[PDB]
Amino acid sequence: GDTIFGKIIRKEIPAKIIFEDDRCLAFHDISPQAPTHFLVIPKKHISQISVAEDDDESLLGHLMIVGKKCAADLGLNKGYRMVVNEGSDGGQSVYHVHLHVLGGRQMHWPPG
Amino acid sequence: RPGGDTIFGKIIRKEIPAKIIFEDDRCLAFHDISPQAPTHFLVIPKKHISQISVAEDDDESLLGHLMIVGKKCAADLGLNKGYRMVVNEGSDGGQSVYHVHLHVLGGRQMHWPPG
Numbered sequence: 001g002d003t004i005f006g007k008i009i010r011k012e013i014p015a016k017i018i019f020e021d022d023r024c025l026a027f028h029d030i031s032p033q034a035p036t037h038f039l040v041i042p043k044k045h046i047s048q049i050s051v052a053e054d055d056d057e058s059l060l061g062h063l064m065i066v067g068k069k070c071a072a073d074l075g076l077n078k079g080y081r082m083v084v085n086e087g088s089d090g091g092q093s094v095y096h097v098h099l100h101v102l103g104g105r106q107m108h109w110p111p112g
Numbered sequence: 113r114p115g116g117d118t119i120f121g122k123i124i125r126k127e128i129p130a131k132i133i134f135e136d137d138r139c140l141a142f143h144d145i146s147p148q149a150p151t152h153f154l155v156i157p158k159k160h161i162s163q164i165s166v167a168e169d170d171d172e173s174l175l176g177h178l179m180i181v182g183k184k185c186a187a188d189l190g191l192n193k194g195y196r197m198v199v200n201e202g203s204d205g206g207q208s209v210y211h212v213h214l215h216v217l218g219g220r221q222m223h224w225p226p227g
């Protein structure tokens with residue numbers, strides 16, 4: 001099934017895009033939990049990390065490399081936190097794999 | 113020494129004990145000594161990378177491998193209701209060990225924001 005992130009990838013609804021390539025998209029989160037809070041998502045519709053395949057390893061690592069590069073470009077020189085949520089206990093909100101990147105404030109422990 | 117001399121490098125080389133869940137040629141999964149959830153483990157590369165901000169472009173497959181191993185271990189540990197994966201970078205990220213690592217937490221409802 002389609003999700004709102006599919007609509008964002010397809011440019012059907014607006015989002016504040018930070019970076020795009022042939023295989024992923026980074027954009028600011030509409031409900032930010034830190035002064036900087038963006039998402040990096042694959043264009044391939046993987047519904048959740050628990051169903052990713054071995055062949056997806058490069059793509060998943062690409063989300064993290066893009067995420068760390070965007071974080072540097074956004075001036076997060078004091079650090080940041082990356083989060084992937086899975087399922088109900090993980091608090092996953094959209095069933096399209098997404099990497100949260102949060103910074104601009106002290107992130108606390110435990111991480112939720 | 114291969115893996116460096118952070119606590120995680122020592123664990124990689126079996127010089128400090130740990131409760132190991134999974135091991136392959138690229139990574140190691142082991143339980144966190146100060147768990148923040150009923151299940152809380154770490155997946156780390158055997159290659160020493162100090163922090164995600166300095167990872168190289170050719171580290172992509174290895175970083176993704178941490179997540180695939182993390183999700184496989186979570187399933188093998190019975191985290192059928194889900195889990196949260198976390199990478200901490202630097203001071204604002206709460207990083208305390210400068211060897212790249214993926215936290216996996218579950219067995220309870222995780223809250224938002226994630227710290």
Ligand SMILES: CCNC(=O)OC[C@H]1O[C@@H](n2cnc3c(=O)[nH]c(N)nc32)[C@H](O)[C@@H]1O
Nearest residue numbers: 109119130143144145146200206207208209
């Ligand atoms: C605070 C989160 N930011 C961070 O950088 O997390 C690093 C994580 O490494 C864990 N840890 C430290 N020493 C040891 C050790 O000897 N053994 C084990 N099995 N885990 C350890 C620590 O509890 C923390 O959650």
Ligand SMILES: [Cl-]
Nearest residue numbers: 085091092093
């Ligand atoms: Cl989520």
